[PDB]
Amino acid sequence: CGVPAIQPVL
Amino acid sequence: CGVPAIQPVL
Amino acid sequence: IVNGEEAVPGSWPWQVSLQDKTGFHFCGGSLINENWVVTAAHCGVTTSDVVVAGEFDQGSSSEKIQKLKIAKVFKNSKYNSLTINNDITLLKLSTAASFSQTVSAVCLPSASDDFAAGTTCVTTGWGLTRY
Amino acid sequence: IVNGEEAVPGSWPWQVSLQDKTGFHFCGGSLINENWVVTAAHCGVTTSDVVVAGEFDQGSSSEKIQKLKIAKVFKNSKYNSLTINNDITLLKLSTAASFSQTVSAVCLPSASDDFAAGTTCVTTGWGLTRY
Amino acid sequence: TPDRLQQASLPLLSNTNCKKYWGTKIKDAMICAGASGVSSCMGDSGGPLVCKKNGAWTLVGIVSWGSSTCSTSTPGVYARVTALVNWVQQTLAAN
Amino acid sequence: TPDRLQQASLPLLSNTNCKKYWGTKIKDAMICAGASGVSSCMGDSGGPLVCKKNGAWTLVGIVSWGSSTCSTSTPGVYARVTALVNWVQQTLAAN
């Protein structure tokens, strides 16, 4: 869990 | 409907 | 109700209490018939909640109340949670309420009914008496 | 979110939209596994509502979204509607979500977990951008 | 919350006049009442606002929302039943 | 509401400091965040407040309530997940 395939960009 | 057996007292 | 007064017991027979499984009173409702209750959509009623009809003093164990199970929750599809508009839910009971001197229905108006500003109406409940 | 920014599509894969039968987005949720969603108790979810997973732009008809039916609504029995405390509901899905690059679970903390004041976190959603 | 059922008499307001307090939050399917020294409050939600019509009590409002402090000088907002009745009858009829 | 998903970074506050804004409405199962120039708002409810722990995003809050105007200077209130997790696990386990 908590590890997206598409990384967020903040 | 709307005619209670025990009358309200206001 | 803030600044209200105790009602004569059984005098608002359509008034029901919506309680959760722990027995906590969270919202009121009104019987419209033996199988249906109208309440607010925002009450967030689930089928695990109970409708209590016939109660006056919730601190009493000697009142002959009717604890009714909810079969289905019908939230109005026009309800808008962001504005709280069209705040109505219908509850279909699994077991019909048994009408008596203390348990009966309120009437519904016609869509065309006129209730003028200035008219003195009544509101009932077990909500907070003080904030 | 007021003053937020558009997210990169698919980058918060646990985020779901709770829509009513008319298709209106009323609350968000988070997938915790393929069969369960956590949301707020006050959202007043019913089994007639839908969980939409995989969506980025709700104005788009060409996204491969998953519209999932709710089998059961589990409102926390400690929820207190008067104070909005313990505002959590679990939704059990009738059909499991299908995990993919855009649909996956968020982790849950340990009861003993410490998240300090001052820590920079992120919040996501389709709520109002202006009031 | 109190143990015993409470009641209160309160007047209906017009939407226009209600808007003075509440502004644009007041919609057509809402009806205000109160601002008379009484107020519905937390835990009252969902209950009735009834008015006597031709001798019978009629459901005009459903306790909805109002002041976060249950102020007795501000009007309470109720769901307006006449705007929702057609849905109730369609619902009962199909179920 | 916007069509496309929005996001925002915001800081966690302590309950004590939150109480300065909210007073006694802040309970133990709540956690505040924001007052930083951003705010969760209507329609965000139910969604996540996540914090990165050991490389993985973890659910710390559930969007709950806040300012009626979504003010960016007041903190938003979220359901505190660590206080509710045991219930989630008991629920999943029995169902």
Add this chain to the structure above:
Amino acid sequence: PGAY
């Protein structure tokens, strides 16, 4: 304001 607040729900009731």
Add this chain to the structure above:
Amino acid sequence: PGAY
């Protein structure tokens, strides 16, 4: 205040 208000729910969200």
